[PDB]
Design a protein around this ligand. Structure first.
Ligand SMILES: Nc1ncnc2c1ncn2[C@@H]1O[C@H](COP(=O)(O)OP(=O)(O)O)[C@@H](O)[C@H]1O
Ligand SMILES: Nc1ncnc2c1ncn2[C@@H]1O[C@H](COP(=O)(O)OP(=O)(O)O)[C@@H](O)[C@H]1O
Ligand SMILES: Nc1ncnc2c1ncn2[C@@H]1O[C@H](COP(=O)(O)OP(=O)(O)O)[C@@H](O)[C@H]1O
Ligand SMILES: Nc1ncnc2c1ncn2[C@@H]1O[C@H](COP(=O)(O)OP(=O)(O)O)[C@@H](O)[C@H]1O
Ligand SMILES: [Mg+2]
Ligand SMILES: [Mg+2]
Ligand SMILES: [Mg+2]
Lengths: 445, 76, 438, 85, 96, 310, 418, 65
C-alpha cells in the first residue's frame, strides 16, 4: 500500500454526475470517450441484473487499458469482486484451461452473508438446579431449570436454562469460577478456560487461565462475511478439518487443483439461492478482468462463448493491444485483435486513442506528484518532448532516476540537466533497436 | 480369491544396500531437515554458545565426589 | 433481490414454441422465426422423449448468430428437469487428468439417468411426549417410550436402544413434527408445531410453526432415487468415488467397471427394478474436437446406452483439428454420414425486430418505435448481438439522464460509445502501425 | 439407578417443557455438587525485597522474587540448620 | 490452519477477533467427507455393486536367510499404521 | 585450505566501483571500464536501496563478453546480504511441477524479504523433581545456578511433560504463552557417564541467571517462504524438497494482508529486493505477457534482465 | 486341453540348427535356409555364452518377412532359461512412468543376472499331531519312512498359528524363516518318502534391475510387478554395481551376461540412440540384438536420412547380419514345417500352388492361408487339404496387392486419399 | 547414534528348540568395543537428497509418507 506502483495514481473515472468525462480528474487524463463508456459499464455492473456481458478494451499499447480497468475497479469499490487475470495464467500443470477460466468466473461472483451471533459470556458464579415440589414418578428428584450465574467486568446475570444443558455442563466439566460462553442459536455451553483471578504466580498452565470477559454478559453483533462462489467450490471439493482417513490423506498428499464437477457447482448454486431467498445472503456480481486476452488459445476462446452465454457469469472485461495477429493454437488464422470473430461478436469494443503531448505532460506531472517528486517546468517540458519521441512509459520511468540523481547532486528538484543525464544513461526501445540494427553482426542469433 | 505371488530371491540381495557401521560415517552431522520442528533459534543462537560444556568442566564434575543428598522440604 | 441466475444471452427462451403438430408459431416461448429449424428440433425432441432409439446425432449448422444455441436451450427447456441434459463445450474434453475418449464417455454417461422406485413405510406425526430412561453409571440398556399424534390418531410406541440413540442424536423434543423411516431408522425433523416454554433463556427467536400432519400415522410412501450412469461409475470405481463425484479427480475408469455397470443396469431394467432415462448431450462448437474424438464418437454412438447427441457448428469447409484435411463443418465425412443436419437460415428485418422486442421485454426495458427501427437497422447492418447489447447500454444511458423510455438519441449515444467489430477493424486499419503485430 | 429424561406438552395454546428426573439423591449430588465459589489466592510477597512474589523455593517453601532473595533465604536456612541442628 | 477458507479457525472465545469474523451460514455450506457419506447413504446402499472379478493378497518376498530385522520392523510399522488409521476408516465400511 | 567457494568467472568482482557521486572509477572493486553502464547500475542500485518505487525493470543489453553478468554480480555484491537478490536463468522457469507463470510468481516473491521480530517470555532451568499424583495434579521443580522454584501443573501441562518424556537432570525451556516444551539438553553428573549416547542427547551446563527469561528472535524470510509454509499442513518441508506446486491465489492474498498487518503492528519489516533473470530471451511469449502485469503489483521487486540477442 | 501357449508365428523354431562347427543345416530345429545369417547368429551366440566381452551389438537387417525375428527367437531358444533374454519392442521404451533413458537402463539391467547359490534346510512331511499350550508346543511329522516329534519355539508356533495347520495336511517348512506352505492333504498329495529334514542347495538368478528395485525402497519389490519404479537414482545403481563387483571378487556370486533384443529398433528416437551409444560402453552392458527392415529412412526425432533410421555413430559400433530372400525350395520347406506345426496334411499339388502363391505375394500370406485351407477342408468333411480349398481361401482372403488394386478401383469411395 | 540392530541369535542357543524360525549367528570374534578410523567420500548431491525428505519419524504424517 505504501509502495507506489504503476497505477497508484488512478483513483477512479473522473466522471461528472451527468456522465461526461472531465479532462483531468481522479488521476486520469484524456481518454474521455473510453472513460464515458467505462462509466456506462460501471452502471451496468452496479445494476446487478445482467450476466455474461463482455467488454473489450482495444487500443495501442500504453493507452490506459489497464488503467481504465483499475479505474472501474476503484469505482465499484471493495464490496464488488474484481478478479484480475492475465491470459498466460490459463496454462496450468494441474487443471485444464477451461477449468482455470471457470474458476476465475466463479471467483468474480461474490456473496455477502449477514448473520447475527448472540452469545452469553461470563464467569460461572452459581450452578443450581430448580427442583419441583412434586417429583414425577413419586421417587427421586426432578429438575425443571438450571440457573447459571454469569459474571463479567460490568455486570452479573442469571439465566434459567433448559434442563438438558446439565449434560453439556458435565461433558465440558464446567464448575464455579470457570469462564464459559453459551450460544443462543445452538444452545451449547463451551468452556473457554478458568478465570485468571484464581491463578497464582506459581501455576504453569498456559491455555487454562483466561481473563474475565469485558463488556456485557449478553453480547450480540451483526457479522458480515464476504465470500465468492469459488471459495465455496474449493472448500467443498477438497474439504479441510475432517477426522476420517480421507482428510488425513488430503493433509498428507500435496495439494492440487482439481476439475470441479458441474454437480458440485449446481449444489453450490442451490445453496446460494436458498440463502438469498432466506435473506441470509446477498449476491454481489463483480467483474472478471482478463488482461492480455490474446495469449488465450483457440480452445479458451471457444469455451468463452458458452461461459459468457451462461446466466451465472459475471461481466468480463477484456484488453488487447494486438493488431491483425494470428490466433494462438491455430495455423495461419488472423483476426483483428488476436480474438476470433465469433467472440468479437459477443463483446462491446471500447477504443482507446493515443495521447497528445499536452496529455502526456499532464500524466507525467501526475506521476511525479504521486511519486513525491518536485519537477521544474523546463524539466517537465523536456521530459514531455522526450515522450513525444520514444513513448510515455519511458518518460514516466525517467522521473525516479532523475530524482535520485538530483538528490545525489544535492538538489530538491529535478532540473533539465538531470533529465538529460538520465536520458544519456538509459536508452529507450527505439534507440536500442537502432543500435542493434547498426551492429547486427556482433550480436547473437 | 487367489493365493498371492510368492517371489523368491537370494538372501544376499536384501543386504545389498546395508553398510556396516564401522564402514560408514555419521550422516546426522548434515541433517538440516531433521532439526525443523524440534530445534529452536534460541537453542542454536543464545543458549548453546553460552552453556556448552568444556573439557575442564566435564572432568571436574566426573572427578568430584557425589553431591550431598538434597535436603527434605521444611515448612518455614 | 437478485438470484444467482440473472438475465443472460438465452434467458428469454422458454421453449421451442411449437403446437401439437410440431408447427412452429411465429413468436412463442421466446423463439421467433427459424420455422424449419424449430420444426426439426421438435421432431428431435419427440424422438428424445420417446427414448427408444439410442445414439442418434443431430447437427445444427448455420451462420454465426442464427440461433443454434438458442434452439438447443429451447430444447433443454422443453425437455424439463426430469430428462438429463448435459451441455458442454468442445474444448472441455481436452483434460490433463483423463483422456479425450474418457471425457467423451463421461459426457455420454452423464446424459443417461437410472431411476429406482421403491415403497417404504413412513411415520409422520407430532411428538406429544418422549421419555428416555438411561443408567446413571456404566453400560446399560436404555428404555424409552414415544407418543406420536396426528389429527386423527395418537399411538404410544415402545422404543428400542437404537431408536433411542437416533432420537437422542436428533434431539427430538415435544412439539417437533418428525418423520421416521421404519427400515433405516432415519429421523428427519420438519418443524415445530408450537413454541417451547418461555421461561427458558438463551433460546433465540422462535420461528414459524408447522401444521400437524393429518391421516394415519404409519403411511406408505413412494421413494424415487435418480442417478446418472456416470455417478454409478464414479462411486463404483473406488472407495473415494463419492468424493470424486464433486472434486472430479476420477482419473480413467476401467472398462471392466463400466461393462459390469451396464450389465447390472440391464438386469435391473429386465427385472423392473430400475428404469433408464435417456437424455441429451449437447456439444457446442463441436468443431474443436479433434479426429480422435470424432472417431470415438463414431463407434460410441453405436451403444444402447448412448444418449441423443446434438452438435452445433458454424464452420464451412474447414480443416479438421489434428489433421490437414478440409471437411464440411470441420467434421469427418464418416461422422457426418451418421447424423442428420438441421440448417438455420438468416433472419429478416421483422424477425430481428421481434427478437429485439422480446429481449427488451425480458430486460424490462421500454423503448420507442423510432428507437426500435434504428436498432433494427443497426442490427441488420452490424449483427444481432450488437443490437442486443445496445439495448441494455441505451437503457442505462436513458436512466442516467432521468428518463423513462429509450429514445433514438440514447441509441446513437451508445452507438458512438461502443463499437462493433467492423468499425473497430476500420479504426485499427487507420492506426495499423500503432498496434503491435501485423 | 437411572436418569429419566422427560419432555411433555403442557398448556401455556401449548408449550414444550423438558424435565430430568434422578432416581436417587446420590446421582443428583454427583451431577449437581452445588460447589461453593472458589476463593481468590492471597498474593504472596517476598519477605526479602517486598516485591510481589514470583517463585517458591521448595526446600524452605518461602516465596521470593529475586536471586539475591533466594541467596539470602538459603543463607538463613543454613544458619537455622547450624543453630537448631 | 484453515487459511483462506469460509470456515474459520477454532477461536478461543468471543474475546478473539476471529469469533466475530466468520458466520455459521458459510460453515453449513461446506460439507466434510463424513457429511457427504451421510448425504449419499441411500445411493451408496443401492448403487454400489461393482466387485473385482479376482482378489489377491499382495505379492510376498521370500528369502532363505533374510535379514532378521526387516520382518519385525515391517510388522511394527504395519501395526502402528493400523492402530492409528483403522479407526478413521470405519466410515468407508459400507462401501468396502 | 580449499573451501567450497573457489575462483570463478566473477570472483574478482566485489562491487560497482563508484564514488559518493555515483561516478565510476576506471578500475575499482574489480571492475574496469563500462563507465556509463556502471553509473546506470549505480542509479538502479540507489533505486533498489530506497525501496519506494515498486516494479521497476532494467535490461542490461550488449554483445557477449561486454560485462553484463559482471555488472549484475557487482550490483549483487554492492547490495548487502540483507536485501534479497534472486539470480535465476531464463531456462529455470520451465518446470515439470508448476506452470511458467507460477515459476515467475515464486521468483518474484523470493525477491521480497520480510524481517520478523518476535519477543517471547520463557522459563528456562534444569529439572530437579517431577511428582505426579493419581495424571491429575502435580508439581515441577526447576533450578538455575542462582535460583530454584516449584510450579503447580495442570492436566495439559502434565500431558505435555509426559509426552516429551522430561525427567530429572533435563535442561528445558517452556514458553509461557503457548506451554510448548522443548528440551535443550541434560546436565552432566557422575552417574551419567554413558558409553553410548542417543542421536539427540547432548550435555549442557545448567543455565545461570533468572528462571524467567525473554527470547527475542529476528529473522529474514521471503513472501514465498510464508506462502510455502501456509500452503499445506507441513509446508515447511516443501522449502527443502521444492515440491510446492501451484499455490492458490487466495492464500497469497491472505499472506499479503497478514504481512501488511504485521508491518503495521511493528512485528515485521519489508525489504524489497532484486530479481535478476539472466538470458531472458529464453522466456516464452506467455512469460513476457505475465511479466507485463506482474511488475504492476505493489509487491513487485526490481526486475533486472540481461540479454545478448540482436 | 488348451493351454496358454498356443501355436504362434515362431512356435516351430526350436533353435538355430547348427553343427559343432556352427555350419547351419538346410533344415533343422524348425529353421530352413538362410545359411549365412544362421552362421552369423551362431557366432554371436558363442560370443554370448563365452561371457567375456561386454556391450557387443549385432543388427539383423533385411527385407520384411526374411526371418529376422525367426533368427532372434532361434537365438533365444538356443540359449537356455539360465541366460537372461529380454525381448522388447522399440515402442515399449516410450513410457509415461519413466524417461526413455530410464527405460533403456532398465532393459539393460534386466539382461544381466547375478547367480547366487545358498544352502537351506527344508522340512517336508505329513502332519500327524499338532499341540499348542499356554508359549510351548509340540509337532509330530511323518514320512513313509520315519516319524518325529519336534519341540516348537515361539516364532514357529506363531507361524503355524497364522497358517491354519491341522492333522493330515502335507506341508513344507523353511526352517530358518518359518515359511509354511500347505501343498495338499493326504489320507490330495502322497506323503513324502525319505528323510523329513533335508539340506537343499537353492540357486537364484537375480537381474540387476531386480536388485535395484528390491533395494530402492521398503516394500520396493512390489514395483517389479506393477511398474511404479519411477526413475531409480544413479546413486543406488552405482552402489548396487559396486556391491555386485564385491560379491564377484569374494566368490559370493557369479555374473551371467545375457541378451537384450529390441525388435523394430527404428522406432527409437535420436535421444535413445545417443544413450545406447554410451550405455554399450559399460562393463555391465549385455549383448544387444536389434532388427529393422528400413532402408535409408528418416531417424525419428530428426530430419536426417540414415541407412536404417539409425545414426551412423551407432552403426559404427554394430555388426550387421543381412538376411536374404527365400527361394522356392526354402519356401516349400518352410510351408512343410508350418504344416507339421499346425497338424495340417496337404497334397503335393497344394504345396506347389501354395509355394507359387507365397513367392508371388508373401511367405506370411501363405502361412496364413494354410490354416484357412485346413478349416475349409474340415468344413466339407475332408481330411487332406486340396488345391480347391487353397483356391477357395485365396478368393476369400485378399493379400496386400489385390486389396490395393481393388481400393484403387474405388478410390473415391474410401476416406482421405492422397 | 545409539542405533541398535539385532542381527540374530547366538549359535550357542541354536538347540534350545527343535524348530524355531530364527536366524542363528556366530558369536563375534573381536573385542566388544571396536574402533575404526575411516575416510568416506560423499558428494554434495548426497547431502542434498539426504535433506530433501525427512527420515524416520513416529508421527502419522511421516509414516504415511
Ligand atoms: N489517461 C491516463 N491518465 C493517467 N495515467 C495514465 C493514462 N493512461 C495511462 N496512464 C498510465 O501510464 C501507464 C501506461 O500503462 P497502460 O496505458 O495502462 O498500459 P496498457 O495500454 O497496456 O493498458 C500506466 O501506468 C497508467 O497508470
Ligand atoms: N430465433 C430466435 N428467437 C429468439 N432469439 C434468438 C433467435 N435466434 C437467436 N436468438 C438470440 O440471439 C442471441 C444470439 O444467438 P445465438 O443462438 O447465440 O447464435 P449462434 O447460433 O451463432 O450461437 C441469443 O441470445 C439468442 O437468444
Ligand atoms: N568491466 C569488467 N571488469 C572486469 N571483468 C569483466 C568486465 N566485463 C567483463 N568481465 C569479465 O568477462 C567475463 C565475461 O563477462 P560476463 O559479464 O560474465 O558475460 P557477458 O558480458 O558476455 O554477458 C567475466 O568472467 C567477467 O569477469
Ligand atoms: N528361415 C526360416 N525358417 C523357418 N521359419 C521362418 C524362416 N524365416 C521366416 N520364417 C517364419 O516366417 C514368418 C516370417 O516372419 P519374420 O521373417 O520373422 O518377419 P521379420 O522379417 O519381421 O522378422 C515367421 O513366422 C517365421 O517363423
Ligand atoms: Mg452458439
Ligand atoms: Mg552474461
Ligand atoms: Mg520381424
Amino acid at each position: 500500500t505504501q509502495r507506489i506502483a504503476s497505477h497508484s495514481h488512478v483513483k477512479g473515472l473522473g466522471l461528472d454526475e451527468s456522465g461526461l468525462a472531465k479532462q483531468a480528474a481522479s488521476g486520469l487524463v484524456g481518454q474521455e470517450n473510453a472513460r464515458e463508456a467505462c462509466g456506462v459499464i460501471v452502471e451496468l455492473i452496479k445494476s446487478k441484473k445482467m450476466a455474461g456481458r463482455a467488454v473489450l478494451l482495444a487500443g495501442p499499447p500504453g493507452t490506459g487499458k489497464t488503467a481504465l480497468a483499475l479505474a472501474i475497479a476503484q469505482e465499484l469499490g471493495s464490496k464488488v469482486p474484481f478478479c484480475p487475470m492475465v491470459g498466460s495464467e490459463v496454462y496450468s500443470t494441474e487443471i485444464k484451461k477451461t477449468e482455470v477460466l471457470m474458476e476465475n468466473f466463479r471467483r468474480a461472483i461474490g456473496l455477502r452473508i449477514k448473520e447475527t451471533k448472540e452469545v452469553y459470556e461470563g464467569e460461572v458464579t452459581e450452578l443450581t438446579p430448580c427442583e419441583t415440589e412434586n417429583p414425577m414418578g413419586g421417587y427421586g428428584k426432578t429438575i425443571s431449570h438450571v440457573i447459571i450465574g454469569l459474571k463479567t467486568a460490568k455486570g452479573t446475570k442469571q439465566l434459567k436454562l433448559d434442563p438438558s444443558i446439565f449434560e453439556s455442563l458435565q461433558k465440558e466439566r464446567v464448575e464455579a469460577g470457570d469462564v464459559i460462553y453459551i450460544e443462543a442459536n445452538s444452545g451449547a455451553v463451551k468452556r473457554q478456560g478458568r478465570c485468571d483471578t484464581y491463578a497464582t504466580e506459581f501455576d504453569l498452565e498456559a491455555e487454562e487461565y483466561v481473563p474475565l470477559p469485558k463488556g456485557d454478559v449478553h453480547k450480540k453483533k451483526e457479522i458480515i462475511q464476504d465470500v465468492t462462489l469459488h471459495d465455496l467450490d474449493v472448500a467443498n471439493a477438497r474439504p479441510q478439518g475432517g477426522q476420517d482417513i480421507l482428510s488425513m490423506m488430503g493433509q498428507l498428499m500435496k495439494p492440487k487443483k482439481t476439475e470441479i464437477t458441474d454437480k458440485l457447482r449446481g449444489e453450490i448454486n442451490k445453496v446460494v439461492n436458498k440463502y438469498i431467498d432466506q435473506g441470509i445472503a446477498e449476491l454481489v456480481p463483480g467483474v472478471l478482468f482478463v488482461d492480455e486476452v490474446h495469449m488465450l488459445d483457440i480452445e479458451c476462446f471457444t469455451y468463452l462463448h458458452r461461459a459468457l452465454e451462461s446466466s451465472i457469469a459475471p461481466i468480463v472485461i477484456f484488453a488487447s493491444n494486438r493488431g491483425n495477429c494470428v490466433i494462438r493454437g491455430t495455423e495461419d488464422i488472423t483476426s483483428p485483435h488476436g480474438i476470433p470473430l465469433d467472440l468479437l461478436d459477443r463483446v462491446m469494443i471500447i477504443r482507446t486513442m493515443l495521447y497528445t503531448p499536452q496529455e502526456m505532460k499532464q500524466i507525467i506531472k501526475i506521476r511525479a506528484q504521486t511519486e513525491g517528486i518536485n519537477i521544474s517546468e523546463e524539466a517537465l517540458n523536456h521530459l514531455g518532448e522526450i515522450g513525444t519521441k520514444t513513448t510515455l512509459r519511458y518518460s514516466v520511468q525517467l522521473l525516479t532516476p532523475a530524482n535520485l540523481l538530483a538528490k545525489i547532486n544535492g538538489k530538491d528538484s529535478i532540473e533539465k540537466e538531470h533529465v538529460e543525464e538520465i536520458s544519456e544513461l538509459f536508452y529507450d526501445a527505439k534507440s536500442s533497436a537502432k543500435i542493434l540494427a547498426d551492429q547486427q553482426d556482433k550480436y547473437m542469433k | 480369491i487367489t493365493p498371492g505371488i510368492c517371489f523368491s530371491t537370494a538372501s544376499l540381495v536384501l543386504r545389498a544396500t546395508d553398510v556396516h557401521p564401522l564402514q560408514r560415517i555419521d550422516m546426522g552431522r548434515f541433517d538440516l531437515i531433521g532439526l525443523e520442528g524440534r530445534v529452536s533459534r534460541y537453542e542454536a543462537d543464545t543458549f548453546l554458545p553460552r552453556h556448552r560444556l568444556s573439557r575442564r568442566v566435564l572432568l571436574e564434575v566426573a572427578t568430584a565426589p557425589d553431591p550431598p543428598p538434597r535436603p527434605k522440604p521444611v515448612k518455614m | 433481490v437478485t438470484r444467482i441466475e440473472r438475465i443472460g444471452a438465452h434467458s428469454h427462451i422458454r421453449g421451442l414454441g411449437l403446437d401439437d403438430a410440431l408447427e412452429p408459431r411465429q413468436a412463442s416461448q421466446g423463439m421467433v422465426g427459424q420455422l424449419a429449424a424449430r420444426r426439426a428440433a421438435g421432431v428431435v425432441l419427440e424422438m428424445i422423449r420417446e427414448g427408444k432409439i439410442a445414439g442418434r446425432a443431430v447437427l445444427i449448422a448455420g451462420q454465426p448468430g442464427t440461433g443454434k444455441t438458442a434452439i438447443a436451450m429451447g430444447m433443454a427447456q422443453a425437455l424439463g428437469p426430469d430428462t438429463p441434459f448435459t451441455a458442454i463445450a468442445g474444448s472441455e474434453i481436452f483434460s490433463l487428468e483423463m483422456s479425450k475418449t474418457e471425457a467423451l464417455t463421461q459426457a455420454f454417461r452423464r446424459s443417461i439417468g437410472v431411476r429406482i422406485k421403491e415403497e417404504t413405510e413412513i411415520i409422520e406425526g407430532e411428538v406429544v411426549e418422549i421419555q428416555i430412561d438411561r443408567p446413571a453409571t456404566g453400560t446399560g440398556s436404555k428404555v424409552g417410550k414415544l407418543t406420536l399424534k396426528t389429527t386423527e390418531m395418537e399411538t404410544i410406541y415402545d422404543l428400542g436402544t437404537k431408536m433411542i440413540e437416533s432420537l437422542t442424536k436428533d434431539k427430538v423434543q415435544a412439539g417437533d413434527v418428525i418423520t421416521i423411516d421404519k427400515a433405516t431408522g432415519k429421523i428427519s425433523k420438519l418443524g415445530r408445531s408450537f413454541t417451547r416454554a418461555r421461561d427458558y433463556d438463551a433460546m433465540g427467536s422462535q420461528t414459524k410453526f408447522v401444521q400437524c400432519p393429518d391421516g394415519e400415522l404409519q403411511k406408505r410412501k413412494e421413494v424415487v432415487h435418480t442417478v446418472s450412469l456416470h455417478e454409478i461409475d464414479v462411486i463404483n470405481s473406488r472407495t473415494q468415488g463419492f468424493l470424486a463425484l464433486f472434486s472430479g479427480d476420477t482419473g480413467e475408469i476401467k472398462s471392466e467397471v463400466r461393462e459390469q455397470i451396464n450389465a447390472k443396469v440391464a438386469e435391473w431394467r429386465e427385472e423392473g427394478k430400475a428404469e433408464i432415462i435417456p437424455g441429451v448431450l449437447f456439444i457446442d462448437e463441436v468443431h474443436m474436437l479433434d479426429i480422435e474424438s470424432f472417431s470415438f464418437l463414431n463407434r460410441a454412438l453405436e451403444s444402447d446406452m448412448a444418449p441423443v447427441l446434438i452438435m452445433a457448428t458454424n464452420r464451412g469447409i474447414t480443416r479438421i483439428r489434428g489433421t490437414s484435411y478440409q471437411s464440411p463443418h470441420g467434421i469427418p465425412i464418416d461422422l457426418l454420414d451418421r447424423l442428420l443436419i438441421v440448417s438455420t437460415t438468416p433472419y429478416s428485418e421483422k424477425d430481428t425486430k421481434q427478437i429485439l422486442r422480446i429481449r427488451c421485454e425480458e430486460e424490462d426495458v421500454e423503448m420507442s418505435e423510432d428507437a426500435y427501427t434504428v436498432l433494427t437497422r443497426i442490427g441488420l447492418e452490424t449483427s444481432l448481438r450488437y443490437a442486443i447489447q445496445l439495448i441494455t447500454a441505451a437503457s442505462l444511458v436513458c436512466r442516467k439522464r432521468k428518463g423513462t423510455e429509450v429514445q433514438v438519441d440514447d441509441i446513437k449515444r451508445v452507438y458512438s460509445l461502443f463499437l462493433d467489430e467492423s468499425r473497430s477493424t476500420q479504426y485499427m486499419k487507420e492506426y495499423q502501425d500503432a498496434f503491435l503485430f501485423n | 439407578p437411572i436418569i429419566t429424561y422427560h419432555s411433555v406438552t403442557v398448556p401455556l395454546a401449548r408449550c414444550s417443557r423438558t424435565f430430568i428426573t434422578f432416581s436417587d439423591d446420590a446421582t443428583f449430588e454427583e451431577w449437581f455438587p452445588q460447589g461453593r465459589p472458589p476463593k481468590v489466592p492471597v498474593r504472596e510477597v517476598c519477605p526479602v525485597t517486598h516485591r510481589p512474589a514470583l517463585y517458591r523455593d521448595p526446600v524452605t517453601d518461602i516465596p521470593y522474587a529475586t536471586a539475591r532473595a533466594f541467596k539470602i533465604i538459603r543463607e538463613a536456612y543454613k544458619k537455622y540448620i547450624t543453630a537448631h541442628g | 490452519q484453515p487459511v483462506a477458507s469460509p470456515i474459520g479457525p477454532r477461536s478461543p472465545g468471543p474475546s478473539h477477533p476471529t469469533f466475530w469474523t466468520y458466520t455459521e451460514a458459510a460453515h453449513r455450506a461446506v460439507l466434510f467427507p463424513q457429511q457427504r457419506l451421510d448425504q449419499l447413504s441411500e445411493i451408496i446402499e443401492r448403487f454400489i455393486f461393482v466387485m473385482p472379478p479376482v482378489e489377491a493378497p499382495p505379492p510376498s518376498l521370500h528369502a532363505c536367510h533374510p535379514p532378521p530385522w526387516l520382518a519385525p520392523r515391517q510388522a511394527a510399522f504395519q501395526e502402528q499404521l493400523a492402530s492409528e488409521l483403522w479407526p478413521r476408516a470405519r466410515p468407508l465400511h459400507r462401501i468396502v
